[PDB]
Structures are given as C-alpha cells and as structure tokens.
Amino acid sequence: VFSLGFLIMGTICALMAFRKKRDYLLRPASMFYVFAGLCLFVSLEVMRQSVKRMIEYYYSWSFACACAAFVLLFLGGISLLLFSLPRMPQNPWESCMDAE
Amino acid sequence: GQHNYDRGPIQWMACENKGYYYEIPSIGAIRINTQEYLDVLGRPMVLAGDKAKQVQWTNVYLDALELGLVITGTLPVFNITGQFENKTNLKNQLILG
Amino acid sequence: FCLTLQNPLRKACISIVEWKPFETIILLTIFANCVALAVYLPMPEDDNNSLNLGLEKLEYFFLTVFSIEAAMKIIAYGFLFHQDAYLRSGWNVLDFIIVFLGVFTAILEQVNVVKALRAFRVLRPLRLVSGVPSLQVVLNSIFKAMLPLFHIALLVLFMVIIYAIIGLELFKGKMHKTCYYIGTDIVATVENEKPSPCARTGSGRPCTINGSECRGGWPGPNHGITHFDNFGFSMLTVYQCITMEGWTDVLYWVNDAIGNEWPWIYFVTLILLGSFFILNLVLGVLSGEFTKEREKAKSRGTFQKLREKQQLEEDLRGYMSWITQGEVMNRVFRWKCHDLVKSRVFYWLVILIVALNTLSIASEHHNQPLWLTHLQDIANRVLLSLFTIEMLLKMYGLGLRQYFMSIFNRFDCFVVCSGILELLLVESGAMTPLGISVLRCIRLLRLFKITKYWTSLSNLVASLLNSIRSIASLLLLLFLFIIIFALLGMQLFGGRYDFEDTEVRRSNFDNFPQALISVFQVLTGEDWNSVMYNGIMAYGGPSYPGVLVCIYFIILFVCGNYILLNVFLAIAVDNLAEAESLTSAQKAKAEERKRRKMSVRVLCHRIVNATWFTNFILLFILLSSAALAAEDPIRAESVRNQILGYFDIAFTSVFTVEIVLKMTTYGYFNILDLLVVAVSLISMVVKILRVLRVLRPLRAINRAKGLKHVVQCVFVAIRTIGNIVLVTTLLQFMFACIGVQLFKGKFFSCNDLSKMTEEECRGYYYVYKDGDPTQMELRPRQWIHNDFHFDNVLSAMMSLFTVSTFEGWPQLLYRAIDSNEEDMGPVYNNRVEMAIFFIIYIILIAFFMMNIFVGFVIVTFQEQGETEYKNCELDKNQRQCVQYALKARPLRCYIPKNPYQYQVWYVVTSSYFEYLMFALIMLNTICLGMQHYHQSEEMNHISDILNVAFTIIFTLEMILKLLAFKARGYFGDPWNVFDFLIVIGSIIDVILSEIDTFLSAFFRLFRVMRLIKLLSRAEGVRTLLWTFIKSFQALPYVALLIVMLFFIYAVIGMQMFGKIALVDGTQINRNNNFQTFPQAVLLLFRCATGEAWQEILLACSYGKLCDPESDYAPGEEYTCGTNFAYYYFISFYMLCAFLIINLFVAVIMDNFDYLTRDWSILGPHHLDEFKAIWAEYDPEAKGRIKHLDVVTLLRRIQPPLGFGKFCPHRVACKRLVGMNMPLNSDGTVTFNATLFALVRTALKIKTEGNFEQANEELRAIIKKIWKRTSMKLL
C-alpha cells in the first residue's frame, strides 16, 4: 500500500513542478520514487519468505516485473535527484543554492 | 617442550650421574623416550654374562593376539660381536632384544 | 645575573659543576639504563633467573643517580618561583615525572615484603631525547604537521561511528552458530579451515561435513574477538577492516551466517570510502604542508646553501684537476695507452666483462651439475686477474693521485684486494667453515660495479649523499620509537603466552630481539591483528580488562605510521625537489654553454561520421562486453553458454559492417579494429584466441576522445619513470643473490618435525587433534618444499617481490630463522639474526625506494603545471582572487514578510535552535549505540519508545522549516532535500515496525543516516570533502582505466581459472573463486588490497582439481589450474599499483591550490563571508544595494579583507571615498564591482591614472570577462 501510495503522492509533486516556474518542488518528487522503489524491495523480500516456508518455486511474470520496477524506480529516483540537485561546485567561487 | 631455556646444566647433571638425557618436544615423542631408559638400566646385566640369563615368568595378562589369560617366560639376548678377541664393545652394552 | 632572588653561594657553585661532561655522563648513564631494560628477560608466573635478580639491584643505583640530579637542579636554580618557571619547560617535567614515578614504586615494593607499576620504567628512553637538542627539533617538526591533519582525523572518527552503528544493526547477534559434531562440543572443521559460522535453513553455509550438526551457543569467530554485537566490538572490528588487514575474513564470515548477496556492499564501500579516499586526503594534505614548508625555507635563504657548495665543489675538482695533471705531468707508450683508455671502445668493453660476472652470479643454484660448479671457479680466477689489470692499468695510466678521487674508483680498489684476499685465504688451507661462506659473500660485490653505469640518477644519488646528515636523524627517532614500544610490549605481553595449546605463536614478545621483530611486523601492517588476538587471549579473553590491551595495539599502528609519513614522504618531497630544481638549474647551465660555441563515397562517410551513428555503436560495445562477462566457465554444454553464443554471432556481424564501410571512405589504432572482428568469426589453438576476444572493450577507448587522451598520458608516465624501475630491478637482483647464498637448500621440511632429513621422512606418523594425546590419526609423511624459496636466483626474486608487497613476509622471515643446513630440516630459532636481511630489504625497497617513486611522479607532475610559465603582472594569488571577482554570483536568503511567518522565521534560524537540534542528533547517536545482544525486554521496548519519540521531534523541525521558508525556499538548500529524505524514511520505518506487532533492516538505516547532518555545521570538514569529491567527479577518465583494467582481468580469470573446484581448505572456495564475473572482480579487489594474494596465486597453478560439474576424461581429475598464474598475478599487482599512484597523484594535483594555500594571508574563505554578510542586505540578488548599508557592510568584515579592530572613523571613512568605486544612482552600487576595489585594495594596490591598467590586465591573462567588467573597469 505504501509503495503504491508513495508513488501517487510523488506524482503530485512531479506533475505540479512542471508549471509555474518552480523546480525546487521536484526535489521531493525524486524522494518518493526512491521510497516507492524501496517499498517494493521489502515487498519482494516479503513474498520470498512465503514461498520459502511453503513442491517447488518458480517466478515468471510478476517477480521479474517488479524486479524491473524496483530497479527502475530505485534508480530513476536517485538519478533524477542528482539531475535536479545543482552540481558539485567545481570552482572555489561557486556555492550550492547559488543564485539563479 | 619447545623453549629457549638453557639445557647445558641438565645435560651435565645427566652425564655426571651415569644417567641419560632425553628431549621431548611433542606428544609423538613421548612414547619412545619414556621407554628408552631401560637401555641404560640393562647395561650392568649385559656385563654380568651368563649369570644374567635367567628365565623369569610374567604376571598373568591378556594376550596381544586374543589367546586368553597367559604368562610369558623371558630371556634377554645380548649383542656379542667379536667376543673371540674383545674387539669393540661400543654398542656391545645393550641387549639385542 | 638577573636572578630575581636567591640564597647566597654557600653551596650554589652547583652551577659551576654542570659544565661539559656532566651533560655527557648523565647521557651515558641513561644509555646504560636502556641496556638494563633490554637484557631483562620476562618469565611467566613470577619465575626469575639469576640475572634478573642482579638487574633489580641495578635499578636502585639508576634510581638515585637520576634522583640526585633532580635535586641538584632545584638548588642550582633557585627558590620555588623558579620551580613554577621550570614547570613551564617541557624537559624538566618529563625528567621529574620519571624519577618521581620511579621512587614511588620502589617504596610500595620495598614496603610490600606493583608488577603493573614496573611498566612506567620503560619511559626512560624518552629521557634520552631530552639530552640531545638535535633530536628535540625533529620532534617539533613531527608535532607541527599535526594541526593540518585534524580535519581528517575528525572525519575518520565520524566514519567509524557510522559503520559501527550500521554494521551493528545489520549483523548483530548473527554469528553464533558454528558446525558441531552431533552430541559433542567439538567444533568440526576441515584441515586448514578456521572455524566459521553455519546456518540451519537460511542463506548461510549449511554443514556439508559427514557427521556434524549446526547448533548455537558458539562464542564467535576469532575466540569471540570479532563480531558486531555491542558497540565496542562492532567498532574494534570496523577499525580493523579500515586498515585493510583481515577485512575479507570478516566479509566471508558475514556471508556465511547472513547470506551471500548483500553484505559485499557494506564492506566494499567501507574499504573504498574508508581507506582509499581517506588515504588520498591524508596524503594530499601532508604534501601540501611540505610544499609550504619548503617555501618558507627556500625563499628565506636555503637555496644558496646548496647551490654554492655544489658549485664550490665542482669548481674545486676542476681546480684540483688542473693540479693533478700538472704535478703528474715516463714513456710515450704509456700516454698512448691512457689515451686509448679514455677512448670510447674501452667503454663498451668494461660492459663486456661485467656482463660475464652477472651471468656467473646468477648461475648458482641448488643441486647443480659438476661442470657448472667448476666453470664458475674458472671464470672467477680469470676475471679476478682481468679486474687486476684494469686497476693496475688505470692507476698507473692516468695518475696515482686522481685515481683516488672518484666515488667509483675507490671501490675498484676494494674489489681486487678482497678478491685476492679470498684466493689467498682458501689456498692456504684456511677456509674456516663459516668463512668459506663468509668470504664468498663478498664476491657478491662485483655486481655493484654496474652502479657507475647509470649517469642518470647521478644527480639525485649525489643529492641524497649530502643529506645523510638529514636522512639519519628522523630514522634515529623512528628507531627510538620501536625500542620504547618493544619494551612496553615486553611489560604487557612478556611471558604471557603460556597457552596450553600445541600450536606455535611465533610472533611473541619474550626476548628483546623477538619483541623488536614483533613491533616491526605491526608497523608494516602485516598480520598485525593476529598478533593482537594472542594478546587479548593472554589476558582473560574478550572481557572487560582483557580487551583494553587492544588500545595499546592501536596506538602502535596509528602513531607509528605517522612517523613513517614524515620520514619517508618528507625525504621524497624535499630531496626530490632539490634534485629536480638543480636538474633545471643544470639545464639552464646546459644549453647556455652550447649556444656559446655556436655563437558513392560521400553518403556513407556522412552516416558514419553522424553523431547519431556513434551512439548506436557504443551501445553495441556495451552489449558485447556484457556478453563476455555473462559466460559460464565450467559448463560449456549449458543452454546459457549456447544462447550467449548466438549473441556472439549477432554483434560481430555489425562491427564487420563498421569495418568494411570504414575502408569505403578512407584508404595505429585501426589495426586493432581489424583484429577483434576476425577473431570472433575464426572462433565460431581456439583456446588461446578466446582470451584475445576480451579486448573488444579496449577498442571503445578510441571512440571516446577523453579515453584517447588518457592512455596517452599513462604511456607518458612510463617515459621518465623507467630509470627508477631499472634501478630497483638491479637491486632486487642484489638482494636475491645474497638470499640465494644464505638460504639455498635450506627450505625443506618434513611433515613431522622430528625426522630431520629426506631419508628419514618416509612412512606414517601420528597427528593429534586439538593437542589431545588420546585422539590420533595416521597421516603419511612427506618431504615438503616451501612454496617460496631461494633456490635459484629467479626463485629468490619472486620471494623478494612477495615480501615487498608485505604479504607473507612474516612467514618467510620465520622460515629463514629456522633454517638449518644445506639439505636438512629446520631447527627452532637456529639463526634469529637473519632477520637483519629481511628488515634491511624492507627499509631499502618497500620504504625508501618506493617512496622516491611516489615522490617522483608528483614532482614531474608539479612541473606539468609549472612548465607552462605565466610571467604576467599578476601572480598566483591574483588569478585565484580576481577571476573569482569577475565570475562571482550572489546567494539567496529569503527573509519573508507577513510577520506571523517572520515570527517562525527567526526562531528557526537562531543559534539556540542549531544548538538544540545538533544536540538531539547527539542524543540519537547514543540511543543507537546502546543497542546490544541479549539485552533485556525493558531495554527492548524503550528502544521503540525512544525511536518513535525522536521521529516526532524531527518531523516537527521539518514543519517549522516549511512554513517559515515558504517551501519554494525550502528545497533550495541541498541539505533540506537530504533532511526531507531521512525524515520520511524514518516515518515509514516507525509504521513498518508497528504493523509488524499489530498483526526490514534496510529502513532502520534511516535512523542512523541523520548523523551525516552534522557535516552541515562543520565548515572545515565539508570544504575538505567538497574539494576531492569535485576532483574525482571532474576526472572520471583516470578511474576509468582502473575499471577497464579490472574488467579485462576478470574476463581472463574466468577463462583460465574457471574450472578449479571449490573445496574448502584451499583459497579457491565458496567465497573466493573465479566462477562468475562478479566473483572474479571481487577476487581481484581482494588483490588490490593485498590480502593473501600470493596464496591465491599458489592455489591456481596447474595441480588443482576440477569440479565434477565440469567435463573431462576420467583419470584426469587433477589437471586444471595453469602456470600462467604467475605472470597474470604478477602483472595485475603491478598494473593496479601503478594506476593507483597515478590516480592519487592526479587528484592531489587538481586541488593543489587548496593544499598549498597558506590560510594566513588570503583565500576565498574571506570571499565567501563577504557574500554571507551581503546576503543580509540582499534577499535575492538584484545586483546593487543601498549606499546607506555600505558603511555597515565594512563593519562586519574581517580586517585582512576590510577594516581593523580599530574604530572606523578615520581609516574606514577616508579610504572608501578615496579608493575607487563606480558611482551609479544614490542607493545603487553593485555587488559585482564593490568586491573588486575592496580586494584590489587589500592586495594588488595601484596608483591613479592606471585604473585602466588593472582593467588592461583583466582581459589578457584572465578568462574571458564576458562583458561584465565594464562596471568592474570603471
């Protein structure tokens, strides 16, 4: 419920940050996509225990789906974060949160 | 044991008293050095000559080969080489077995 | 006199007493006290021999001599005020503690009729650095360098505290289930395996032994010393992993219990962040300190001390050459012979008979033939007389006097004299059975004759020679530090190894020679922690006073490797800067002399050169390099290995298409593009080709013009170097030829150490398990031969190479000490004095000669940023302050309005809110350190009471920063983005911990990562972290080569070493194999560190057996492995160690401005605080501010940038109008140009009329202005 819900909340920060000239807002949108990434990875681990305690096991259609949506949301969130945090400053004069 | 303490005085004591010296560093070295002193104690028997060749009978004990209770009569064999002429005697003070 | 008081001179001629020798009889008394502490022999359980009894009768005599002088200085000086003054002096206090703390323990002892109060006596050798002032100044240059390093050592401490907490949370209580025999308490391990954890039904390693059951209650992995289940043991075992000594056994243990797939990350990341990054920072800061120090000397007067006396010596030898030919200058023929000798031909025929000798020396080996022995005796006696003739001819051909002068002609005298001295000694009947070895040792000098042939480091060796006054004094105070520690080791651990095991703990602390050796082994880092576990077990165990011995162990590693930076690196940053400057000075000497005697075809090309086209190919190299790494080594009949083979035939059609299209337009790097493509089509000896199929990735480098330019730089780094690489190779040959003459034939052993030779070592013998004489097993006995031995010269060299890497050097050293005779088995402590060879080699190679190799790459890269010569009107400090003044840009502050929000705004930005909330992170640390294993159930719930009570607090500092900063201004700071993430991450964990019990260890790390918030306040730590993180990110190409190298090696490694079996007891086991690409890379990483890298090399060399899931004809189970391992392993250790000194030096030299800044005068650290006061006058930037606030800006400034600790009425009123500024409207003077004349005043200060001349200079040497200087000109 948290992996779905967090993603929904994240969208509301991301859909509203493409309008009205605000880009600061996006910073939290990239937070909730890491969390929505990591709240499937608990889910993935939680589902593995059920099959381990219970005759064989094989996953075909929706573990490797969610293990491609974990790796998408977990790494499309951290990269969106670094593609929205300003830069490493690279010069002695420059500072983060530098004007404009 | 394996150690660095000086062994010269101990060797001297053994030499002075007509005993012997034995090192033991290891557990597998215990079994042949704590039986080996009977080579020294047998010496004045092998110098007694024929007088020392007396049969002795052992206490009853179980046989090595599972025979049952038994007693063994023993005799010692001496190493006599070149007796005719009394040529050596360097290792002629031990029993052959 | 200026006594300031006094009693009369009734006895106070004590100041007469103290003239010349009293300073040197009490320096001779103290050396006699250090030999009495050395010859003490510590015995277990209060047992003493008779020399220890006569040595405590000497202590009383040494206690009063030091005790009367401590009274004869409180009377030679004056009354008690004087005593306070003396207290100020450092030496008196040290000398008064030692001899007041000496009478304190002699009296509690003499009453008692204390064995930890005997320990303070070891402090005596420090009293000897008091009596030498030439050593008192060496200590201060140690301690002065310490302040710069403070920001680092505070960063290492906050990095051990994160991973001690994180590690604890992740692995607490896990490692308590080892394999056990059923119904018994005997731990069940294999023969060379140490006890490691198990797991019933998890991911761990289940028991796979015939009769063992996995049960709990096991104390833990090294006698319980290593694990993470409280805070002190978690942090002792994170500190050990940081020093890269034993960090894989912790990782392996962790996998075994917890599982294989995750814990690689905690360890790899720690090693990379913890050691390599920190090592780079520490190294860079120290180097900067040395440059600054060099600067204070060379600009003061120290350049002309070494230039004159090097010129006054070379003018002396020229003056004395004008004499020695004059007085010297009976037959003309002799003169002709001398002329011929000068002639070059003679210089290609000294290299002829010296090359005879090297071959002769190298041909000694063990159990050699009989013709080979006698040929060396023939060639010796020939080349002795050939060496006789040259010396006689030389000394008689050009003069007897000036033969004496040369630094090499003196040695040519020594060769033939001690060459004939051996040929006269044996051939008299006087071999003297050690001297027939001891006199053969000296014809190992004849291979030192090639030392004159260099003429290349002839400049640096000479510089080094001058400096043997300076070389020796720091080595003296490192040697006085290894003595004190050895003595201390003797006090704590002497006679305390009385363990009743039958195993050998040979690096102990029982003699003084042995203690010294043990101490040296802890400084080289080698196996230092297995020396510590014997010292925790010699006290109780992993208990409360038992483990406080570990602090002693920690000090010797840390504070003792601080000296080794100041010694070796100081040498390599000072004496390789004079020998370079002088090389430039002899270069300006050079060519100034030589100037004196002189005075359809178009479309395809477009598609190919298309940018879109390139990004279509460089993701076919990204797919074909994933297909090399996904291959399965053992099973060639897999469906995986088949279905990856169709991906082979897909891409190497496409690179063919790239090849033929390329020779439609055009007619060295493209002979590599031809080769790769042919190899696949051929591969679809096949085996050899396959390895040559992994070089596809390398071709990708041309693709990137960055990757083109960096392989060029790496190739350049091989140009200037290969005289150091040659000099070291010639010396590795001299120590390998001494080591052959010392240890040849002698590394044989029997299986049981009773049978002393090979004729005896046949049969079976009984081994005994855990030292229990009732439980034995038969094992056959064989005459084993050591894996690293000195048996021919090539063999000796390999051993030396392993020793330089410091891996296994302790084992070799012990093997050397026990060595008996030419072909016999070992004797315990037969020749302890063969530690000298190993130690000398280590000082010579691994300390001293590798450190003029790091100190060389630096100084030839300082000039890469100095051969570009900037002689304009503005110097270094101007470019880094004016260009900043051109390109500066204002901050933001967001002071809001609507004073309800201003009410919340000022409460949040206060100092007592930053003091409140950086004191609650300090309470959240302590609540997370309090966690332990088998804590109580009342401890169990208040940890969930507290962790929910911290999350409600930190959620409420986040609402107060949302409503005040008006959230647009909240996600503007990067530290509020990160703090938003740690808040939300720990609210979910509060939920997910509680929906657990209402009806994930990854979210419990959202509690501990809030401690990184403590970097937001420390300014000096964050400027240090930003500087290197900027540079690593700005130089990804440098690290890329390392990555490329790893990729190439891993691909090869799976292909050769892929089919060894994972049997446990060997070094290719289930943690350390070459079966998969991720595994191979991990194995390689272990090697960069040097963990048991030689061991791995031994493990995979032909004899090894293949796993059953591979295919092979039966009877051939023992045929995998390869001998290519020697080349491969040696190659990786050398290419990876050269790319790591290339990466470190490349990052030190992009931040050379931070590191040689000298924070006194100026930096941008003043230029930052200007804007942070300007931020109080600008909400957002707008350029300019009012002029009413300009005078209130200058009151806020530090006086090296603005105006003083005086009142601003005279200087600050008059200068602000008189010094220039642009005049726009009343309250409009800009940011961009007020900061100019404010820093143009502080330095680069000029007269009027030439206000255009500062603007004239700001266009030529400066980066383009961009048109912004049109208000900065005016």
Ligand SMILES: *[C@@H]1O[C@H](CO)[C@@H](O[C@@H]2O[C@H](CO)[C@@H](O[C@@H]3O[C@H](CO)[C@@H](O)[C@H](O)[C@@H]3O)[C@H](O)[C@H]2NC(C)=O)[C@H](O)[C@H]1NC(C)=O
């Ligand atoms: C009974 O005593 C005789 C001597 O009284 C023992 O004979 C001696 O045995 C030793 C064994 O070490 C022989 O010495 C060996 O000599 C050979 C040369 O053949 C040499 O190669 C060896 O290194 C060793 O020195 C010695 O020849 C021999 N003495 C005589 C006089 O024959 C005999 O061993 C004793 N009996 C038993 C069963 O031990």
Ligand SMILES: COC(=O)C1=C(C)NC(C)=C(C(=O)OC)C1c1ccccc1[N+](=O)[O-]
């Ligand atoms: C840097 O390369 C190494 O890793 C070295 C180490 C650790 N071990 C040994 C003993 C070296 C050696 O003796 O070279 C002949 C080398 C070496 C050090 C310095 C200069 C050159 C080389 N080299 O040639 O490999």
Ligand SMILES: *[C@@H]1O[C@H](CO)[C@@H](O)[C@H](O)[C@H]1NC(C)=O
């Ligand atoms: C393992 O132990 C069992 C029980 O003694 C034995 O029967 C079996 O032979 C052993 N393993 C093999 C492969 O023989």
Ligand SMILES: [Ca+2]
């Ligand atoms: Ca090491």
Ligand SMILES: [Ca+2]
């Ligand atoms: Ca090591």
